[PDB]
Ligand binder design. Structure first.
Ligand SMILES: O=P(O)(O)C(O)(Cc1cccnc1)P(=O)(O)O
Ligand SMILES: O=P(O)(O)C(O)(Cc1cccnc1)P(=O)(O)O
Ligand code: DMA
Ligand code: DMA
Ligand SMILES: [Mg+2]
Ligand SMILES: [Mg+2]
Ligand SMILES: [Mg+2]
Ligand SMILES: [Mg+2]
Ligand SMILES: [Mg+2]
Ligand SMILES: [Mg+2]
Lengths: 362, 362
């Protein structure tokens, strides 16, 4: 659409500013410049731009109802795009490191960045680090004189930290808590006692929901100078609820959506993740099903993986997904209605974000 | 000494604040809290605290000559300590990721963090990420109302980025530039044409000197509200020059200092690094020596490593080190003399920092 081509045009400006800076200030050679250019394209582009386009949507909502000079309108949209790219690049940073940590093979229908032959884990770790640093270069350069600069940096820091904390909860979600010990190699849980909805909710709240929904929605408010015009407690509740749903969808897709469609190859069963499928299965299985799950979960062996998928299909988790979805539809609509008391415009943005999320097939 | 025990006491406060926050705001369980506690201790403690104690030194320099209430003095010292810990933790972040990228085995006389049995590359990548995030939590929490907060965040961002850029220059310093290509597995240089003093200087300037010398010296100025009282161009020159010397020392030590003393196990020859030894050797070798260097460099094979060390010993690089050191002594003293025109107190801090650096055996 544009909107999205216009958003991508701002990516072009940001890439040129970043790479011209590397040549002019960081003594970079043209071949390392080209490597960082392809790195940025491979890691930042080719997705749906949900996060970045969410900040644009929120900004456009307020521009429709607020009086501004034309030049001001132009500035607000451009700030929305740059703010949207900071999040897309923060996401890029997490996905590069996540793919290494998850042992994944494909991202956005291409090899994970670390699996590019001329990349490898060694470089990719540091390239993911660079992606996050570029987010701060963008912010300091583009928003230097903006009133919202300090609030934005502080919120960005907290979202980032929550995400890294969340990634720790995730990567250790298959170990017994009482057995974590840097000194002792971590064995997988045999009881699965920590595969509960509460624990699942905590992992997901931190690892995903701050950056996929909370940050973009509040960033759209910041660039609009409209933050004080919403109830922040409601923004957070609805972010965390739509975020959790987004991650539940991701978990279902990891197992059940063909890689040609999804653009990734699922690893949750083999990595022994505390996914929504595993928790929900365990929430309804009889003693024999639990037993068979335990004998097959968290192994690379394709025959073992197939048994778990069979257990999932037989357990009729599509009923559970339907009942979970219907509950979230209830809760999201209820939050949108509460948002409209102070912010009809922001509520409608949340409605659109919800609608796009709910219908994605990724 | 104290000074350093007092500095470590501030580490205790910062750790407690961070871990109490994780329990109170991030829903952490006591066993993950304990893992992050040992992670922070293993990665942040046990070194010499040169960086952190440099900010304390600079602050103490100004307190001696400036009138302040007692309570103000106390606040400035505490800010110097917290600012010193931000750098120590930024360093901790780089060393955790660097040890993975370098395939190193020992750090501060213990296993590299990623080699702890109960850690592994998978966790350690994300733990290094957390270490840097904690630097921003510290800053926002402790310096929230300080006049220097914005300058400090902006300088911290730029030092960090320069370091990550520098780490890219380092990790790729053994590939031919014209052959870098994410699509093609990177072969080692056979001509060594990019092992030059200019290229060496650029790698070292970015990967090391911003965070080891520039940041702590300017941080001491920031917490002292004294930045405007020095010539920033001189601070940068002297930082970058003492930083380069510090890294040359590190390179010499990697090959020639026994691991029991150094607290690390050298990998530069096996990793094919553009070290000061390799560049300097190539700066004086005859055609046969160059030939033999090329037949042995950048291989894990202990017999090959021993040949390179033999070539280094025979090449009398201790003459070259002596001539390089004598030159830097000249240049550093000259910079200190220039610093004294506006800043006798800061010049004396630089003199102490230089003296401590020059005499280290690490
Ligand atoms: O894209 P992925 O790998 O399916 C995922 O959503 C990626 C991701 C990375 C970081 C935080 N949240 C989600 P995950 O949790 O790994 O299943
Ligand atoms: O401690 P190391 O590994 O000797 C080193 O100094 C560590 C280091 C990490 C990051 C930036 N600068 C130096 P290196 O460059 O790897 O030789
Ligand atoms: C797994 C994850 C963090 C997905 C974000 O979705 P997107 O619609 O913006 O497309 P992409 O996922 O490829 O960024
Ligand atoms: C290699 C490197 C970045 C060293 C810093 O020196 P330090 O004196 O402060 O002790 P440690 O090196 O262990 O931090
Ligand atoms: Mg993943
Ligand atoms: Mg993951
Ligand atoms: Mg997934
Ligand atoms: Mg190293
Ligand atoms: Mg290194
Ligand atoms: Mg070294």
């Amino acid at each position: 659409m544009a909107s999205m081509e216009r958003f991508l045009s701002v990516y072009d400006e940001v890439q040129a500013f970043l790479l011209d800076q590397l040549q002019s200030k960081y003594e970079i050679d043209p071949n390392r410049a080209r490597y960082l250019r392809i790195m940025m394209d491979t890691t930042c582009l080719g997705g749906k731009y949900f996060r970045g386009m969410t900040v644009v949507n929120v900004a456009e909502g307020f521009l429709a109802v607020t009086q501004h000079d034309e030049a001001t309108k132009e500035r607000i949209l451009h700030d929305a795009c740059v703010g949207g790219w900071m999040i897309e690049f923060l996401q890029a940073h997490y996905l590069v490191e996540d793919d290494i940590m998850d042992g994944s093979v494909m991202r956005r229908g291409k090899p994970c960045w670390y699996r590019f032959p001329g990349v490898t884990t060694q470089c990719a770790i540091n390239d993911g680090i660079i992606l996050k640093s570029w987010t701060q270069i963008m912010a300091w350069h583009y928003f230097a004189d903006r009133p919202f600069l300090k609030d934005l940096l502080c919120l960005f820091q907290k979202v980032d930290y929550a995400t890294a904390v969340g990634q720790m909860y995730d990567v250790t979600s298959m170990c017994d808590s009482n057995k974590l010990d840097p000194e002792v190699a971590q064995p997988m849980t045999t009881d699965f006692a920590e595969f509960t909805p509460a624990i699942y909710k905590r992992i997901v709240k931190y690892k995903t929901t701050f950056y996929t929904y909370l940050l973009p929605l509040v960033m759209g408010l910041f660039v609009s100078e409209a933050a004080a015009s919403v109830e922040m407690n409601l923004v957070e509740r609805v972010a965390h609820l739509i975020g959790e749903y987004f991650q539940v969808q991701d978990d279902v897709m990891d197992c059940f959506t063909p890689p040609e469609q999804l653009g990734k190859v699922g690893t949750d069963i083999e990595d022994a993740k505390c996914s929504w499928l595993a928790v929900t299965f365990l929430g309804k299985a009889n003693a024999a099903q639990v037993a068979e799950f335990k004998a097959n979960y968290g192994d690379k062996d394709p025959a073992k993986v197939a048994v778990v998928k069979r257990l999932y299909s037989e357990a009729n988790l599509q009923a559970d997904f339907a009942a979970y979805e219907a509950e979230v539809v209830r809760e999201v609509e209820s939050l949108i209605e509460q948002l409209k008391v102070k912010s009809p415009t922001f509520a409608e943005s949340v409605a659109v974000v919800w609608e796009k999320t709910h219908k994605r097939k990724k």
